[PDB]
Amino acid sequence: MMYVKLISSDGHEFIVKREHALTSGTIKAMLSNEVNFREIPSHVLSKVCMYFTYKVRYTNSSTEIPEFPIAPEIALELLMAANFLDC
Amino acid sequence: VLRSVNSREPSQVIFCNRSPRVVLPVWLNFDGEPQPYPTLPPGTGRRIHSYRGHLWLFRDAGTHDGLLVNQTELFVPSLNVDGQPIFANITLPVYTLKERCLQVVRSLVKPENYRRLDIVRSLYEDLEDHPNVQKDLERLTQ
Amino acid sequence: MDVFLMIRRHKTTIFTDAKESSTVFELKRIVEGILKRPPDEQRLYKDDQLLDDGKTLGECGFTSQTARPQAPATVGLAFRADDTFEALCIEPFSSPPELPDVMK
Ligand SMILES: Cc1ncsc1-c1ccc([C@H](C)NC(=O)[C@@H]2C[C@@H](O)CN2C(=O)[C@@H](NC(=O)C2(F)CC2)C(C)(C)C)cc1
């Protein structure tokens, strides 16, 4: 299993599957096995990684799709990170 | 262009809301105009009478966010085999992380306060671009 | 049945999935392939409780209901420095800013 490491702006190291991170076109460009995000804090990057798992699991599925939770305190920063990463 | 056909052939269907949203069914009449119908609470079902060749789409009754019916955008009632009515599974789609964030931000700040948020002006324009049935209908016509 | 986990130690977080019927040792083998540390040098925790190698993930409270893709369960990891193990330490994530007045 191939993994990549995404480092937040506060030093937190998130290790995710390679195909999970390749769904973001921006991350795919910075990979071509480590990517540093000078602007994305850990409480935002952890939610981004949770979306990768949520997306891969629930795309093309007849099972009932659950709502992706986003706390209001992180909504603005996550939106800016989602805009930058295009996912 | 994108309208229901006046077939006069009845078709029974069950609108089943498998989503945490209040579902607004939308029927496109014979002139292509969208006609709203009574809303569906989350987890509830409604056995309704429609016709073959009619066009249906479903959306969040509160924010007009797009929804999926039978894993697609448009639901067309077909022929009833052995008297068994058709099932219309209304589910949440896998929103992009960007759009999902816009939904949450839209539900928290008033559209007059979109400018008061500290974001890139491109994101401000994305926030005001509310999901509209008329907008998606032009896009659905390829 | 798949469970979705966050294996955390210090400032390291591993996003991965495993079977509810898989064992704690088999999860240690997953960590081994990622962090290059053998299972005899790792200790896995649910909250503050040590996990037994032979017990399944479902027996240790990791189920599909509690370990969802959008909200994965957290598994604490502790390594062994030479002879003795370290204490379980997990760096918390950064704190989000206060709610703006326009949002409140
Ligand atoms: C409670 C609830 N919650 C969610 S929906 C719901 C609900 C409520 C009432 C209904 C009624 C009984 N049914 C229809 O509106 C159908 C469905 C659609 O196909 C258009 N239609 C028509 O009858 C059209 N008439 C014809 O087609 C002809 F007779 C061939 C000329 C018009 C011009 C509109 C009268 C259906 C669902």
Structural domains present in chain A: 2-87 (3.30.710.10)
Evaluate whether C2 touches C72 at the Cβ level (below 8 Å). no
Ligand 1 mean position to B13 CA, how many Å?
A: 11
Rounded to the nearest angstrom, the gap between the alpha carbon of residue C52 and the centroid of all alpha carbons in its chain is 14
Among C38, C8, C3, C9, smallest CA distance to C23 is for: C3
Q: Is residue C25 part of a domain?
A: yes
B23-28, strands of its sheet edge to edge: B34-36, B23-28, B55-60
Asked whether the beta carbons of residue B104 and residue A87 sit closer than 8 angstroms, the reply is no
Place of tokens 């909504």: A75
Interior/surface letters B68-99, b for 16+ CB within 10 angstroms, e for the rest: bbeeebebbbeeeeeeebbebbbbbbbbebbb
Give the 3-state secondary structure of residue C94: coil
B20: left (phi over 0), alpha (psi -120 to 50) or beta: alpha
Among B40, B49, B35, smallest CA distance to B20 is for: B40
Sign for the pseudo-dihedral over CA of A8, A14, A20, A22: positive
Tokens of A33: 């096995």
3-state secondary structure C12-78: EEEEEEEECCCEHHHHHHHHHHHHCCCHHHEEEEECCEECCCCCECCCCCCCCCCCECCECEEEEEE
Among A2, A17, A73, A25, smallest CA distance to A49 is for: A17
C79: containing domain: 2-85
Tell whether B113 lies on the interface with A, counting CB pairs under 8 A.
Answer: no
Q: Is residue C98 part of a domain?
A: no
Among C75, B39, B15, B102, smallest CA distance to A68 is for: B102
| CB proximity under 8 Å: A 6-25 to B | none
Measured by CA distance, the residue closest to atom 16 of ligand 1 is: B50
Give the 3-state secondary structure of residue B97: helix
**End-to-end Cα, chain B, rounded Å:** 11
Asked whether the beta carbons of residue A12 and residue C93 sit closer than 8 angstroms, the reply is yes
Q: How many CB atoms lie within 10 A of CB A86?
A: 13
Q: Which residues contact A56 (CB under 8 A, 6 or more apart)?
A: A19, A20, A23, C69
Question: What CATH number has the domain bearing residue C17?
Answer: 3.10.20.90
User: B10-93 is classed in which CATH architecture?
Assistant: Sandwich (2.60)
Distance from CA of B105 to the nearest CA of A (A): 6
Contacts of B122 in chain A (CB under 8 A): 83
Strand C42-46, strand C73-81: pairing: antiparallel
Q: Is residue C64 part of a domain?
A: yes
Topology at the third CATH level for domain B97-128: Elongin C; Chain C, domain 1 (1.10.750)
Cα–Cα distance, C14 to C95 (Å, whole number): 20
Q: Is residue C104 part of a domain?
A: no
CB pairs under 8 A between A and C: 74
Place of tokens 């893709």: C69
Q: How many CB atoms lie within 10 A of CB C48?
A: 7
Q: How many CB atoms lie within 10 A of CB B123?
A: 19
Q: Taking the domains of chain B in order of start, what are their residue ranges?
A: 10-93, 97-128
Amino acid at C89: C
Ligand 1 mean position to A30 CA, how many Å?
A: 53
B53: left (phi over 0), alpha (psi -120 to 50) or beta: left
Same fold, B10-93 and B97-128: no
**CA dist list (Å): A42 to C11, C46, C81:** 10, 22, 27
Evaluate whether B104 touches B117 at the Cβ level (below 8 Å). no
Ligand 1 mean position to B59 CA, how many Å?
A: 18
Q: Which residues contact A82 (CB under 8 A, 6 or more apart)?
A: A48, B96, B97, B98, B100, B101
- Listed in sequence order, the DSSP H helices in chain A are 18-21, 25-31, 42-58, 75-85
**CA dist list (Å): B99 to B83, B135, C6:** 40, 16, 25
Ligand 1 mean position to B49 CA, how many Å?
A: 6
Evaluate whether B14 touches B86 at the Cβ level (below 8 Å). yes
Q: Is residue C102 part of a domain?
A: no
Q: Is residue C92 part of a domain?
A: no
DSSP letter at B95 equals -
Interior/surface letters B19-54, b for 16+ CB within 10 angstroms, e for the rest: bebbbbbbbbeeeeeeeeeebbeeeeebebebbbbb
Give the 3-state secondary structure of residue B45: strand
Among C95, B42, C43, smallest CA distance to A43 is for: C95
B59 lines ligand 1 (CB under 6 A): no
Q: Please, which chains are in contact with B (at least 3 CB pairs closer than 8 A)?
A: A, C
Among C15, B106, C10, smallest CA distance to A48 is for: C15
DSSP letter at A72 equals G
Place of tokens 């850990």: A42
Structure determined via: X-ray
Q: How many domains does chain C have?
A: 1
Q: Is residue C101 part of a domain?
A: no
Contacts of A48 in chain B (CB under 8 A): 97
For C16, the closest chain A residue by CA position comes to A16
Q: How many CB atoms lie within 10 A of CB A66?
A: 16
Strand C2-9, strand B23-28: pairing: unpaired
Cα–Cα distance, A78 to A69 (Å, whole number): 12
Contacts of A63 in chain C (CB under 8 A): none
Helices (H) and strands (E) in chain B, counts: 3, 7
| Data resolution in angstroms | 2.3
**Which residues share a beta bridge with B113?**
none
Asked whether the beta carbons of residue C72 and residue A50 sit closer than 8 angstroms, the reply is yes
Give the 3-state secondary structure of residue A48: helix
Place of tokens 């591993």: C14
Backbone angles phi, psi at C70, to 5 degrees: -85, -10
Among C85, B98, C53, smallest CA distance to A51 is for: B98
Among B89, B125, C8, smallest CA distance to A65 is for: B89
Amino acid at A7: I
* Interface probe, candidates C70, C98, C99, C102, chain B, greatest B C-beta count within 10 A: C102
